[PDB]
Amino acid sequence: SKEESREFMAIFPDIVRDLTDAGRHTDIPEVTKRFAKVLQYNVPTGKKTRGLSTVIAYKMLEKPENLTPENVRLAGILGWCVELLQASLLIMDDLMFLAINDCLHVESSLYSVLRKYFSHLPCYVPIIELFHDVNFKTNMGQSLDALCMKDGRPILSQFTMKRYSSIVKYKTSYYTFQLPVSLGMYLADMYDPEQHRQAKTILMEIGEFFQIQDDFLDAFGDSKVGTDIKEGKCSWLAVVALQRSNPAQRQIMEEHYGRPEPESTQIIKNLYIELGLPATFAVYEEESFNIIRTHIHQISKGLPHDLFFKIMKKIYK
Amino acid sequence: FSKEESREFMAIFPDIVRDLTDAGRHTDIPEVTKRFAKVLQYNVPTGKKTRGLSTVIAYKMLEKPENLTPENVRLAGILGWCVELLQASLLIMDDLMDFLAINDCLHVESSLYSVLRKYFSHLPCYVPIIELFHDVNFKTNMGQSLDALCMKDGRPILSQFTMKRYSSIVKYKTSYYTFQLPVSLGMYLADMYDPEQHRQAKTILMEIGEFFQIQDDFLDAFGDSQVTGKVGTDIKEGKCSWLAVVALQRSNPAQRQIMEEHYGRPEPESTQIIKNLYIELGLPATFAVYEEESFNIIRTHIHQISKGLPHDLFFKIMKKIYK
Ligand SMILES: [Mg+2]
Ligand SMILES: [Mg+2]
């Protein structure tokens, strides 16, 4: 809603003041002034889907009578901590020392925000541990992604659906889907590991569709102009292409996948069309939607079905 | 450090590797975990481990003798390895900025929080220790940013080379994680939470940290390469060195123009011109006076140490740096 978006965006200026203009580090004003610009440039622009998802999750997990402006604001601050992590990850991926240090500094700042607003609450240690664990798992995901590339060349023998599913889970789904919902759960004082486990099984399945759709639209979407083929990325399209390819089609992937020449991108796009990847994606979208929806209906305990259907409608519709 | 202290500390390392890579977790991604074990083994346990062993020595000299069990000294060792994980992440990053990727650097640092949760999450010192690592991380980042702001394009900004800025760089970039972190970890593991005690320690440790870096800066230009086993490149790299800061303080207009023209140039001739100016400006004699004056100030601050802190810990740390 407009009200949700506006109240969330209104928190950002207070976070910048907390990190750069709170009377700390008085001997190095040039660094804190510059850090405020780094935050202002890199963190609050474009869509804040992960941050707003944290507030939505909290609103639908908490007891209606506990949903106070103060508590919704705490959910918003957790949302901004997720956006500080998102900004650190985006900046690094765009860069790939002053630039690199800025990404580490943005990520490090979220723990200062957690200490200021949550150190006095029971959810403090669970939330800190969640951020630590998600950071470790994200690093493992980036490492698996990099093990699909040798020199500047994609290793197509590594492009298996099993490896693809693991990359998406660790590199993307944990911090994009699990982190917002688990933060909402902890702020609502839901600590039952079985509740977090059940949420995870669903959110990892939604996360996999989210990235497969992103991969499909990289090549077949209507105008950014997608560069997955050029960059030799382990994309769902490349994985399914290798499954469906005859030896002659496999040779085309080996020769042209991950080449910089615009003709090589066109050759791969044409092969994807020849292999019927658009039709294969259409079938996956319908079947995955139906399968996840069945799994949400089987969700027991005090987990609201409503939250997972809302997340689905955002991604699928 | 004693033979027993060193051997007991080194015995912990293979456990931390198994804890992080071979304890039944991340069952679906064995290629990544097997690789990460090699990243830890190849980068973390090699060389001197001064910061890690300093954490152990700090704990042993701060804790009540009756509480110094093998189990507690082993927890001090695990905290020391958490400092060495941080140190390995910073050293890998320095080497990449001059096989391993940037992501490995992030992964090695992230792993220390997994070790902290495993071994300390049950103790009252847990949140203080986590918050100390978070704060030292943020301050180290600020130090690295301040250091980077002394360079514009590929050239040093000599107007930025002030003693005030140099002192702030050494404090935030180096002294907090190298000197404060080991001692504050030792204090927290000994259930010493008094901010006055942490601040008393900090006053001394930041003074030791400043001499540590000033001596390192001096030896970069004036050290014996065959003795130190490294050829110094601070002049070529245009680093905000104590030598450069003091040179600019002592320089007449003609001497300053030599720094403007030749400081941070790749040509070996330019390194010799700057070294000759450092000799002309009496930087060796200035360093000798500083070493004597700083030793005496630090020795007195340690003699004066209060808040029930042990003077012998800080004398041991000082003695190691001044030799
Ligand atoms: Mg994409
Ligand atoms: Mg040096």
Residue numbers in the entry:
A (entry chain A): 87 to 182, 202 to 328, 333 to 426
B (entry chain B): 86 to 183, 202 to 426
Provide excerpts from the study.
Here we characterize a metal-dependent, bifunctional isoprenyl diphosphate synthase from the leaf beetle Phaedon cochleariae by structural and functional analyses. Isoprenyl diphosphate synthase in P. cochleariae (PcIDS1, EC 2.5.1.1) produces FPP in the presence of Mg2+, but preferably forms GPP when exposed to the heavy metal ions (HMIs) Co2+ or Mn2+. Strikingly, a unique chain length determination domain adapts to form geranyl or farnesyl pyrophosphate by altering enzyme symmetry and ligand affinity between both subunits.
In both chains, the N terminus and C terminus as well as the loops between αD–αE (183–201) and αH–α1 (329–332) are disordered.
